[PDB]
Design a protein around this nucleic acid. Structure first.
Lengths: 282, 281, 281, 282
DNA sequence: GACATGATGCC
DNA sequence: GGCATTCATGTC
DNA sequence: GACATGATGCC
DNA sequence: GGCATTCATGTC
């Protein structure tokens, strides 16, 4: 029903694929022509379906009855998830050749920072696929099933995970420290200590984040990028990034990434997806 | 020309009137058929125009080209300002006759939690007309002018106010402590330590706000009310509220207001805008 | 057979009586002519016997073999416990008739600040008699027995109390918060956070002690008085003192006691042991 | 006047030699057969004189009239300064060969932890002689001169040093950070945050001390050794110690030192005062 | 990956 | 020597 | 109104 | 007693 605009080009196949690789069973459903998932906004709950319309650079959004009262907020969440604000001419013209292969690349955000926070923590160490598996388990045990849509389940709320037994979370396939990290996060969410929207001083906020137990700088950076859609952060501690820069120290990697300012988040995404990229031969 | 729904009844006259009295010159323009104001998301900017369609039970929103890239977020901000989510049959079903006279009453939110915190602070002790004349000075001195629309001006950002000279703020017409509060508040905004959206535990969040310099219980409650649109808060420390509950102490009032849980914020609005109202026996 | 002199007059009957009511079973032994207790200085342990010789106004201190390596430290502890430094002329010639009925009165100190800290907390609320018994139960559960003196037990160290089970301490007959107060005080002594000797700014030091869980103003003043032997602290919050100043609020009492600076601690003792006493209106 | 015992052997010549080299004019006097210094215990001030008695294995202590009211504490202070508690058979029987040459070695303590902390800081990065003169000036400037013995001045009180102008101290011959380090130490002493007696967990206590400005691991260790007379601390970061363990790093020296637990402080002394001492090759 | 921990220059 | 800051380890 | 100070009821 | 919390009160 609702419709939002975007600026061409937009690589939807890339986006939908990025999301499917990380999709959580019972929460999300990704296809080649649409994206759908459970969504909670306060006590309002339902299903959101996003259908891209290439021919007209439009994104059609449908909301089940339970979300209609907070429609505009659901749209906002969706626009942050898909980076509809992106102007590719600006970014590509700045990254130059690094983005030429896929100019329609966008930054995959989230629909809820707390959720992304939990996702990031569970993304620690393991493969993208294993994290998706792990998150699906946390969701199954602590999530709420939708009454109108049985097949779906809402992502575990902050209050439900805050009152979760560390031993139980551990039993799902994570170390005790990780489970504690999740619980602490939920408490920060309840108290409003976890920025839910992008803060004015990203660098500073990431520091405060790193004081959180179980949250190192990789998690803080990745969370900044996905949870806040911060556009100028690189991930020099990333597993795949260390590979892309063979034999380089975390600090050299960024003095390097420094050339992509102020769109280092986009450069990061391009490097991750350039099969055989290597630093300039010079 | 975007469109958003709302559920009847909706007292637009009352809403626009409430915003009109607190309207900040150059930032907001309030008429009785529409509301408009400057708006900044990140640093995409423009002007927003909201026009109620009583006929269709709809709110029409127009955005200038500079905000189009972030249209959705803009629509969300308006839906919070106008309490479009409200189901009046549920609130009134609970408040009984307290809300029977003005079933279309809504909670006036805000477009940005930071701006609202600043308004809250600049609203202390002084009158409503004053706060508005003062806030306008600030927005005039630290606001971002729109090239697209010269007449309008964006509300100060936290970075712009965090780097502000205290004395400079004071000279605009406020005690030094106030100006200091604004600067602290702005910093907190910069490092995400100020909840920009309603937290799960509103009580805890408000307590934490009270450790902020220049922020007492009244300011935290009012902030929670408009800033987060928390629906179950009361202001037992409010000037007018004390007059509405003659001789009762903050604790006695708060005890009385418990009868309106979980919609105390709405109860508050009704008692505020119902002069001569008084507690039962 | 060690000797430390004092200045007459010295009311030994009053001192022993005071320590007698607070004596902890298995730790201390008090009679009309001597004081005896177990003492530990680091890993050196043994029994200390103090025998006052009025005739020559000198205190005879005997140390079991286990404490000889640290004889001096033991002597210093006795001197602090018995306030042998006091010049009663300077105090009595400063308190007037307040301290005229008993000019030999002294500030009963302690042998170890941590111990006194524990006694202070356990001294909260309950009577002297119950506190003594409560404390005895703690020493019995965590104290170290002496090989050469099976009847004696060493007062618990911070090492043991810090590793104590809150529940174990609770079962001894104390609120959970009280046991938690002990465990925290013990951790503080382990990290050197608990001043074991009178600090330069007693007021500041006490204010900091009040940040400790379970330690309010009364415990901090009393600890400062007995644990650091601070000579100028009053206890406006004390029960007996409240009765000595009927109708007066802590601030009034506090203001009244200012007339006794800088020997308020002594003034406190005298007012405590003068059933008649009443202020001047 | 007063007499304290000690267990033989006791190397008085070595002990007085160590104190003499670090003696502060105006505060102390060290001679072949005696030690003397000003001493303040609250408002009681005077001069303490210590004369060893080899024939009797005793230390004779004389106090000037001004300290008699607090005689016992003065005796205790001297006992800590001269390590009278030490049972050499236990240490040597444990240190073995290391202390076989000088079985009468003792741990030079202090008469006041605050004072010692100050000396510890003033002794940073300079020669023993330099520190002595530096300290003497600090003493003459903020100390209390004795009326009965004009040539003696009591070491500066915390209250006095806390209210000192950072610049006046710098002028005496120390960096500006060194002066603030002293002022900070002084306020800590005023509030009761600087442990004046040995804490139960020396390790934790030192860790906290290192949070003090101007105080690093070296100063914290040295302070524990002298100010608290901790008997099981080593100083792997000491310049001289590094020369005694050529080519080894702090972690290695430290690892090797563990063989002397629980008397690492005595080991340190024996090594410090042993010329071409070197670890075992094997 | 989080986190404790050990190994050039400047002030 | 205190101290800031960047690599290289190395359990869990 | 925020904010120091003082001055009832549940652990 | 410790401590959270309430009700003046005087100031900025």
């Amino acid at each position: 029903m609702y419709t939002l605009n975007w600026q061409p080009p937009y690589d939807w196949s890339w986006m939908l694929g990025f999301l499917a690789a990380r999709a959580v069973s019972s929460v999300e459903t990704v296809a080649d022509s649409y994206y759908a998932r459970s969504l909670a906004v306060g006590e309002y709950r339902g299903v959101v379906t996003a259908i891209p319309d290439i021919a007209r650079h439009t994104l059609h959004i449908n909301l089940s009855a339970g979300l209609e009262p907070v429609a505009a907020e659901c749209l906002a969440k969706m626009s942050r998830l898909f980076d509809l604000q992106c102007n590719p001419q600006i970014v590509n013209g700045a990254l130059g050749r690094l983005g030429a292969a896929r100019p329609g690349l966008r930054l995959p955000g989230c629909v809820d920072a707390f959720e992304q926070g939990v996702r990031a923590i569970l993304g620690q160490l393991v493969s993208v696929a294993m994290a998706a598996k792990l998150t699906a388990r946390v969701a199954q045990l602590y999530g709420e099933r939708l009454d109108d849509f049985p097949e779906y389940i809402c992502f575990p709320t902050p209050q439900r995970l805050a009152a979760a037994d560390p031993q139980a979370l551990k039993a799902l396939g994570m170390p005790l420290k990780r489970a504690e990290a999740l619980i602490h996060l939920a408490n920060a969410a309840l108290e409003g200590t976890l920025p839910m929207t992008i803060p004015g001083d990203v660098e500073q906020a990431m520091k405060t984040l790193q004081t959180f137990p179980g949250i190192g700088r990789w998690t803080a950076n990745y969370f900044a990028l996905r949870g806040w859609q911060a556009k100028d952060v690189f991930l020099p501690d990333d597993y795949l990034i260390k590979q892309r820069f063979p034999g380089m120290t975390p600090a050299q990697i960024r003095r390097y990434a420094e050339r992509w300012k102020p769109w280092r988040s986009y450069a990061l995404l391009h490097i991750w997806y350039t099969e055989g990229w290597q630093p300039d031969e010079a």
